[PDB]
Amino acid sequence: KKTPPVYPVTVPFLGHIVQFGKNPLEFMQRCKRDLKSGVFTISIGGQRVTIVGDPHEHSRFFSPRNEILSPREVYTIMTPVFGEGVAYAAPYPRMREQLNFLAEELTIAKFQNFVPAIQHEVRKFMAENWKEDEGVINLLEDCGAMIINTACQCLFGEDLRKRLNARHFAQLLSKMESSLIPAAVFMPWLPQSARCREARAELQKILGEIIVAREKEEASKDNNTSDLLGGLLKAVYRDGTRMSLHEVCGMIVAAMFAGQHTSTITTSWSMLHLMHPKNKKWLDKLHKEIDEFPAQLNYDNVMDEMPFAERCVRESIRRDPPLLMVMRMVKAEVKVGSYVVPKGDIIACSPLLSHHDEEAFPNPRLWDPERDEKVDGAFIGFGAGVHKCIGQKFALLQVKTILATAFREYDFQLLRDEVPDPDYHTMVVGPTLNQCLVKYTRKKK
Ligand code: HEM
Ligand SMILES: FC(F)(F)c1ccc(N(c2cccnc2)C2CCN(c3ccc(C(F)(F)F)cn3)CC2)cc1
């Protein structure tokens, strides 16, 4: 009944925040290698951080209930972004209720409209920015613009898009997230909240006026508005109450924030690999898959006739996962294989680490869409168990739709010799900005 072997500190109360900041992959790999164990504890400012680095031991982290493993006290940082009483700020039972309303808005039933709506905004963006036949663009900043555009074309109603467009909304999103610093998640003890508040107090009033307007159309039942907002208004809790504007806006914000960073990074990655000359066989097999498709794609095409595309996307999330660390706070310990994690200990599971386990993924730095996890449950890019990703189906659909639409009508050339190196400065990891310069070439008669 002993604890994981603690990696020693040299500079004290720095813990490892410097060695970790530069390159998390190498650091964690070295820790795993030296300690001869996938399971080990590191110190971050004195805090006992315990990583579960053995892909065979994943279900230990993802299976327990919240009362045993609590995300809240480690994920608090998001409380100003979504507001109070929303998500973690709210108690677990009612957060579950909140998440149920959101998940019931991303049902495969809603997805029938999404495919044509995503294609519309991709082709709009390509008509206004891909204007020349040959041009240089930054892929990372462009896929983001496409992700926010198409996501608003899916879950935002006509009237809401007239009173808010995506391009202004993304400026509200960045206005809101800038209060996040990676080194504020382990210390329980704001110069940006002042700008964070004014963004929500702006969005909340805009939404409130759309609601005031929709209740004055509601008389006809002819308004027929069934978007993310439309369903969240109708939401009724277990105890008869309904969502207030504060809880409503927070939910919309969360819906967009979650998808926009993770999806755009995924898309960008996916495009850089296929674009690369070493990956030509994969680009061809992609083409073999999408060449037969009509100009206007339907739900079946993307979902049913596009497995290989999904193999590329998933591989991209397997190789370079957007979220490096998933975290919990232990309230009551349960055995982790042979070791045991004590109460008060901060337990983590790292998609960045696990996705690079030689047994699970031989040659982890190789992009290979046809490869299958050699250990069941190794791939945890969307998480697993109690807190698996509810946006997984939508993001997959979103990225695939974009890839199919882009490659069908364009060719791409990477100004670089090698695929961009990930940037670990940010908490959510994507490829380097100044490395993401790409040349586009339009396909002609
Ligand atoms: C590539 C795209 C995405 C990735 C990589 C991703 C990744 C993840 C991961 C790793 C988790 C687990 C969090 C944890 O256990 O600590 C998660 C949970 C979640 N994701 Fe995503 N996600 C993606 C897209 C989306 C989208 C589009 C949405 C919503 C639109 C979304 C909403 C959520 C939500 C609500 C959770 C709930 C976590 C919980 O149950 O407490 N995600 N996602
Ligand atoms: F809808 C929702 F319920 F409010 C919600 C939305 C997004 C998320 N997350 C999320 C983000 C991007 C894609 N998919 C899901 C996060 C919320 C907190 N989270 C993390 C993950 C890591 C870190 C840290 F410490 F590394 F910076 C901080 N927060 C992981 C899931 C969780 C809940």
Resolution limit in angstroms? 2.9
CB atoms within 10 A of CB 360: 21
Q: Enter the tokens of residue 45.
A: 């400012």
Which residue range forms the structural domain that includes residue 87? 1-445
Closest ligand 2 atom to Cα of 391: 14
Q: 380, 329 in Cβ contact below 8 A?
A: no
Closest CA to 99 of 390, 398, 328: 390
Residues in contact with 328: Cβ distance below 8 Å, sequence separation at least 6, in sequence order: 61, 69, 70, 71, 74, 346, 347, 348
Which amino acid makes up residue 53?
Answer: G
Judge contact between 341 and 393, C-beta under 8 A.
no
CA distances from 215 to 114, 168, 208, 221, 225 (A): 26, 25, 11, 10, 11
CATH number at residue 419: 1.10.630.10
Testing ligand 2's pocket by substitution, the residue of 106, 327, 387 carrying the most ligand atoms inside 8 A of its CB is: 327
- Residue 67, CB-side half-sphere exposure with 13 Å CA sphere: 1
d(CA 197, CA 207): 15
What's the rounded Cα separation, in Å, for the pair 94 and 87? 8
Q: How was this structure determined?
A: X-ray
- Per-position DSSP letters for 363-389, written without gaps between them: STTS--TT---SSTT---TT--GGG--
Atom of ligand 2 nearest to the CA of 95: 3
Amino acid at site 163: R
Other beta carbons less than 10 A from residue 442's beta carbon: 14
Instruction: State if residue 326 touches ligand 1 by the CB under 6 angstroms criterion.
Output: yes
CA dist 329 to 47, 65, 219, 384, Å?
A: 11, 12, 49, 17
Mutate to test the pocket of ligand 1, among 389, 403, 428 (most ligand atoms within 8 A of CB): 389
Task: Please check whether residue 328 is in contact with residue 61, taking contact to mean a CB–CB distance below 8 angstroms.
Answer: yes
Phi and psi at 187, nearest 5°, equal -105, 110
Compute CA distances 7 → 18, 22, 49, 278, 340, whole Å: 14, 18, 10, 39, 16
**What are the structure tokens assigned to 62, written together?**
């993802």
CA of 265, closest atom in ligand 1: 1
Distance CA 222, CA 234 (A): 16
- The Cβ of residue 10 has, within 10 Å, a number of other Cβ atoms equal to 8
Q: Which of 375, 401, 440, 444 is nearest to 119 (CA)?
A: 401
Give the whole-angstrom CA distance, residue 266 versus residue 396.
9
**Per DSSP, what are the bridge partners of residue 428?**
323
Give the total number of structural domains in the chain: 1
Q: How many A from CA of 388 to the centre of ligand 1?
A: 7
Alpha-carbon gap, residue 167 to 224, rounded angstroms: 25
Beta strand 39-44 pairing with 47-52: antiparallel
Say yes or no: CB of residue 382 within 6 Å of ligand 1.
yes
Amino acid at the residue 257:
F
Cα separation of 303 and 370, whole Å? 18
Asked if residues 332 and 68 have their Cβ atoms less than 8 Å apart, the reply is yes
CB atoms within 10 A of CB 217: 13
What Cα–Cα distance (Å) separates residue 319 from each residue in 312, 355, 358, 382?
10, 7, 13, 13
Token pair for residue 326?
């998933």
Residue with CA nearest ligand 1 atom 12: 383
| Residues contributing to the annotated binding site for heme | 389
Output the six-digit token pair for 318: 């397997």
Q: Is 324 helix (H, G, I), strand (E, B) or coil?
A: coil
Question: For residue 389, how far is the Cα from the chain centroid?
Answer: 9
